[PDB]
């Protein structure tokens, strides 16, 4: 999953393109744009720093390193901790920044987004809870690393 999709029209970054590409609902692009580039506008207001750069370091932080996948070895349901590298993580983060921003209170999504990207930027927010959350039960389900695939 994830391929060499070309940068968004404004910032020449493959990643922001993937972010827009994620927030998208159904196929409604050119709307998500207005959010993403807009959450970038709020972010420079609430930091006075380069958003594209904040975004990077924010996603970088949410990038997890391990996870757990359910298995079945005769019976059913076994917790297998596995490592997470390559496009998987980079995607998994976005898939979380954005995903958590959705299920919120607030009002708009442009705002919810800035709110995560910034909190994540400062190593807090539900975004990151998922990160270190599995990660804690990574060293909980430790004893089942031999079921690894």
């Amino acid at each position: 999953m994830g391929r060499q999709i070309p940068p968004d029209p404004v910032f020449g970054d493959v990643l922001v393109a993937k972010l827009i590409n994620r927030v998208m609902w159904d196929g409604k692009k050119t709307i998500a744009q207005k959010i993403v580039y807009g959450a970038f506008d709020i972010i420079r207001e609430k930091t006075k720093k380069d958003p594209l750069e904040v975004f990077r370091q924010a996603v970088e932080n949410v990038k997890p390193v391990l996870e757990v996948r359910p298995r079945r070895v005769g019976g059913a349901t076994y917790q297998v901790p596995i490592e997470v590298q390559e496009p998987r993580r980079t995607s998994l983060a976005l898939r979380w920044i954005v995903e958590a921003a959705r299920a919120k209170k607030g009002r708009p999504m442009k705002e919810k987004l800035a709110e995560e990207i910034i909190a994540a930027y400062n190593n807090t927010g539900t975004a990151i809870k998922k990160k270190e959350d599995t990660h804690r039960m990574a060293e909980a389900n430790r004893a089942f690393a031999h079921y690894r695939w």
Partner: protein
Amino acid sequence: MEVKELERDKNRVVLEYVFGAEEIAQAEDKAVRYLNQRVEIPGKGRIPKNVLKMKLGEEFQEYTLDFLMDLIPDTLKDRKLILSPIVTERELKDVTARVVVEVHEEPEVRIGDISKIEVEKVDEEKVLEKYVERRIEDLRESHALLEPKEGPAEAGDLVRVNMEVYNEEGKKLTSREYEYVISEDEDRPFVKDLVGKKKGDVVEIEREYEGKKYTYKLEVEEVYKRTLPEIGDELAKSVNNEFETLEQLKESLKKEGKEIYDVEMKESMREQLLEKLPEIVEIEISDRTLEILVNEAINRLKREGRYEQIVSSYESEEKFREELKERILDDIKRDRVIEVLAQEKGISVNDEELEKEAEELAPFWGISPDRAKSLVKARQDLREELRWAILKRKVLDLLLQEVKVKVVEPKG
């Protein structure tokens, strides 16, 4: 033993431990005993001092000091350190000995009027109305009032199809009746084709997946007319017993929202108060203490390959290290400000309460509540990571009572 402080650099202090005379020998003894309890030579238990050094050349020396140093930790145990003591230089002469450790005490804080920083809150009453208004509206849609229609399937009707998928030569594989609400001019899969269709019509769509063709026969089963029921006391009835009046359903839904708000918004304020401690914080910290934590971090990045990507997005590695520096300084400020005020106010997370949160993470972890408690009593690593966080979310809470809560009205 004899300890003297060479230099003091804010929180960085360096100690000189000079032993010598006889306690050098008293260790030398301890050295001989423990050593005589290990590897042996073509020389049981009777080997004196000579033997050793004229054989396991040098090592002896090492192992000696190792017992000399033992006499240090008990000078430094009633001091809290932001960085485990690091032994700069060590050396052993026949008569005297000298060890030098560098100590990094916790850096001195200076707060500055918690009332100065502002956090944002969205108008509660005015966001709940927004909530209910939209909740009811979503409740209507679910209780869509519909009646069969004989027209074409213009937008806003509900068509119900039965989709059958055939194998590349007939073998029918699946059958499932889906139903859709036609969205005002939509390019949704399948549905765009059901647009303008009347009952009993079929829409075939063929498709190829890794060589094999698969057919999809979609048959329109029925087309109803949607008209959402009006917001009355009848809408309440429509969602079960208990509520008899609309004003009553709304009540319930408000209560349901204040719930979700009080949790989500409280958490937000916390979050942003934390984002902002460093503004009002100022600490005395040795440049070197930082510069270390910097390496103590950069390195620990190369331990997952991460450093390579990470570095390769800033102008120069020196600018990263530079961003990474202040990044930590700010956190320690925070962390520090928390830890401090937690003592000044006697705030502490007790055993009984440390379990109380642990059971809150049992569902998310996907484990039995008891396995958590098993892991917390047993481990002293998840125990403390969990512990402090709990205290943190407490100290923040307190502080949130002094900050300037700026209230904003909903935009969406």
